[PDB]
Design a protein around this ligand. Structure first.
Ligand code: P4N
Length: 259
């Protein structure tokens, strides 16, 4: 059972918003342990049974996964006010983490973050789960040596990250997740810059259709840029699988550490 007693949670400052309400940082005091920092998703309209069901299904969605690079569910409080208690990735959003540390993070750390996310995505592809919202804004930082995919509810169009078949035909597969992951890798190697800054979504659709791609980030190893371009194959069958990305990223990471 994962019902948590409300008196064991202390609500802290707001760290984001969700479809159902504000998200807070806080503290959980379990019966046997010292303080555990947690994130608390709140729900304004969970007095309505359909809202409570949809909100608590976000906790059930995370509960089905168990991976070191995907945020974990700690517990839930199912009576009003309804809360979902998640693991807190203390260092916060990946984009601002990379922006602040642009001149202090080694290139090996950036490649490590891409590798870690590829392991989580290979795990999700083994469970036949299609994410649809892979982007640096949906990655959190647990430590300088650990990133995680964020909560799937809070991660929920992102045209600038989407494969052409998803934009145009609403087809969402592991191959369309691979295209998004290529964009996320580009964001990481760009220190948290977003794809296609300033460009209108409709223009991006035509540009990608005609072969334009995001350029090689400064200092990105050419082998890693080559791998990103394979993620952006127009034909989804030509994109690598997540297990292939995981193996290739491990090779690129080792090579960078050896330099
Ligand atoms: C879509 S997403 O990638 O899920 C995401 C993005 C942004 C915000 C949130 C809030 N939710 C969570 N935030 C955190 N860590 C966190 C976030 C922001 C900040 C801090 C820590 C302290 C420094 C600061 O200023 N902000 N850990 C876990 C979660 C939970 F609930 F998703 F599991 C989620």
């Amino acid at each position: 059972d994962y019902e948590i007693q409300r008196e064991r949670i202390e609500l802290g400052r707001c760290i984001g918003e969700g479809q159902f309400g504000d998200v807070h940082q806080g503290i959980y005091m379990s019966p046997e342990n010292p303080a555990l920092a947690v994130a608390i998703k709140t729900c304004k309209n969970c007095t309505s049974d359909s809202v409570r069901e949809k909100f608590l299904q976000e906790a059930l969605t995370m509960r089905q996964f168990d991976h070191p690079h995907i945020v974990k569910l700690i517990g839930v409080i199912t009576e009003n006010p309804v809360w979902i208690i998640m693991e807190l990735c203390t260092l916060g959003e990946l984009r601002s983490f990379l922006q602040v540390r642009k001149y202090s993070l080694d290139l090996a750390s950036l490649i490590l973050y891409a590798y870690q996310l590829s392991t989580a995505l290979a795990y999700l592809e083994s469970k036949r789960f299609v994410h649809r919202d892979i982007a640096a804004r949906n990655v959190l930082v647990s430590s300088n040596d650990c990133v995680k995919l964020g909560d799937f509810g809070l991660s929920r169009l992102p045209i600038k990250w989407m494969a052409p078949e998803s934009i145009n035909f609403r087809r969402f597969t592991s191959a369309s997740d691979v295209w998004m992951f290529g964009v996320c890798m580009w964001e990481i190697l760009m220190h948290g810059v977003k794809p296609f800054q300033g460009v209108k979504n409709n223009d991006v659709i035509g540009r990608i259709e005609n072969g334009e791609r995001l350029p090689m980030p400064p200092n990105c190893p050419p082998t890693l840029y080559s791998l990103m371009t394979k993620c952006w194959a127009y034909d989804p069958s030509r994109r690598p699988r997540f297990t292939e990305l995981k193996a290739q990223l491990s090779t690129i990471l080792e090579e960078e550490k050896a330099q």
